[PDB]
Design a protein around this ligand. Structure first.
Ligand SMILES: CCCC(=O)N[C@H]1CCOC1=O
Ligand SMILES: CCCC(=O)N[C@H]1CCOC1=O
Ligand SMILES: [Co+2]
Ligand SMILES: [Co+2]
Ligand SMILES: [Fe+3]
Ligand SMILES: [Fe+3]
Lengths: 277, 277
């Protein structure tokens, strides 16, 4: 029958230029030539699926040692994308509170390898890390070219390699993957980043849930109409992916969980209050 | 053997949010959370090639009845993308000063069908209008859907149809087109817009010139590295096109004439001073 529990874990808050999230949200005009943007706050979160076939983790938030003078993040990154989180927000702690040790995780699904999703991959040395092959390649290049700024953290990648993580790459033209009963990895491909993965979870009580991650930032992104983010890798791929998610949602009667929607996140039942069955 | 003359015609100035031109040019930070943008000015220009095989026109600037309360442009468009031009800047007049009547143009190459490139297509009823099939399709849909805002001017398209222009669409996968001796239409495809066309001109005295139009806004866009515009239709297509242009430039020892580079345009010899042979 399979009766898993799905947990939403609060991994703190991030701020950044609204223009990153919604491209040209407030363009300058003849009467407002020096138009001002805003510095919006949004949640960073991860999802644990306590499944009888094994524990599945979607995204891993930011590394505890990201911010500060001795942080892994470049100063420019910290100033443009500041992450704030109490100690109880760290992924290791959120898992501990559920009496889950990193070594208990069978599968980690990395939606992508941005600094706010792949922060703690290095913990799960007993898991198979599932990632898009193009995203993996892209990140490894950033590392090889000794890129010290941008959304791919050199020090994080460094740790992945040293900790000898076990990778299973999703091929560009690879079908969706049945990870477990009612759990499907969605191959979104290029869009927001080089290679995006999603989850479709079918819960006996709650029903269908799509984890879109950064494929869809917020409800505003989702529309319709679609309001794309400030910087995109593959604009065409991004638009296709959103509409693909909308279709799947309609066809399977599934909720869509956005990557960084403050309003939606407030309404989630977090790991401090319970779970979804 | 062919000894054409190429004219750069000044069709006025436009202003818009700098973020349109260079995506995230000045992102908000923790110390500057309400970062301000700028309202940059840039030139609108067209190119006439007086060729023995016939007169070739690249782009057609804006329509004279674009701006104002009884203008073709929507109010929001006028406020975000204001076009300023004296009467001598109108395309019809620039051509007249060269003793060229619209009926004298054999070929018009529409780089794309944005408001600042396809403004005056409706004049050239005696020409073959060369346009990318995807761009044409895109514009005709805006018309059919009665889209009154955006970069595709309903009234302009209306006039094209009423004036019974003769179209030659460049197919998505169509090779470059030899328009005349030393004049080649470059199929850039999707990028900035649905379908971008460029021109490669080989001048006996001046040598190779690539007309990039909005494939490359400015020298800053060109880099390297590449700094893409704020809104893009096909980001992947855009990046490839830029690098394709760089390659062609290097392989053929050609100058690259950007779409809206104030500095570059300053240095051009305009139709009021002469031409390029
Ligand atoms: C795409 C570069 C900007 C970036 O990395 N943004 C972060 C903030 C939250 O979602 C993200 O991916
Ligand atoms: C796509 C950005 C909005 C737009 O159409 N801008 C115009 C002004 C400069 O050349 C353009 O393409
Ligand atoms: Co991301
Ligand atoms: Co344009
Ligand atoms: Fe993110
Ligand atoms: Fe333009």
């Amino acid at each position: 029958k399979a009766r898993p529990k799905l947990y939403v874990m609060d991994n703190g808050r991030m701020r950044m230029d609204k223009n990153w999230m919604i491209a040209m949200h407030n363009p300058a005009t003849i009467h407002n030539p020096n138009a001002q943007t805003e510095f919006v706050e949004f949640p960073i979160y991860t999802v644990l699926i306590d499944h009888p076939e094994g524990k599945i983790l979607f995204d891993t938030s930011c590394n505890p040692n990201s911010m500060g003078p001795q942080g892994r993040w470049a100063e420019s990154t910290q100033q443009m994308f500041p992450w704030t989180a109490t100690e109880e927000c760290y992924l290791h702690n959120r898992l501990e509170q559920l009496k889950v040790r990193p070594e208990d995780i069978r599968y980690v699904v990395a939606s992508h390898l941005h600094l706010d999703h792949a922060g703690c991959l290095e913990m799960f040395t007993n898991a198979t890390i599932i990632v898009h092959e193009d995203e993996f390649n892209g990140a490894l290049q950033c590392y090889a070219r000794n890129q010290k700024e941008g959304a791919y953290i050199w020090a994080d990648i460094d740790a992945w390699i040293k900790n000898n993580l076990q990778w299973r790459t999703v091929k560009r033209h690879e079908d969706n993957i049945l990870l477990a009963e009612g759990v499907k990895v969605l191959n979104f491909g290029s869009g927001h980043a080089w290679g995006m993965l999603g989850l479709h979870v079918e819960l006996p009580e709650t029903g269908g849930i799509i984890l879109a991650s950064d494929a869809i930032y917020t409800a505003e992104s989702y529309g319709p109409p679609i309001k794309p983010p400030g910087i995109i890798y593959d604009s065409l791929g991004y638009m296709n992916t959103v509409e693909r998610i909308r279709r799947i949602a309609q066809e399977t009667k599934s909720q869509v969980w956005f990557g960084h929607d403050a309003e939606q996140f407030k309404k989630f039942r977090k790991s401090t209050e319970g779970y979804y069955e």
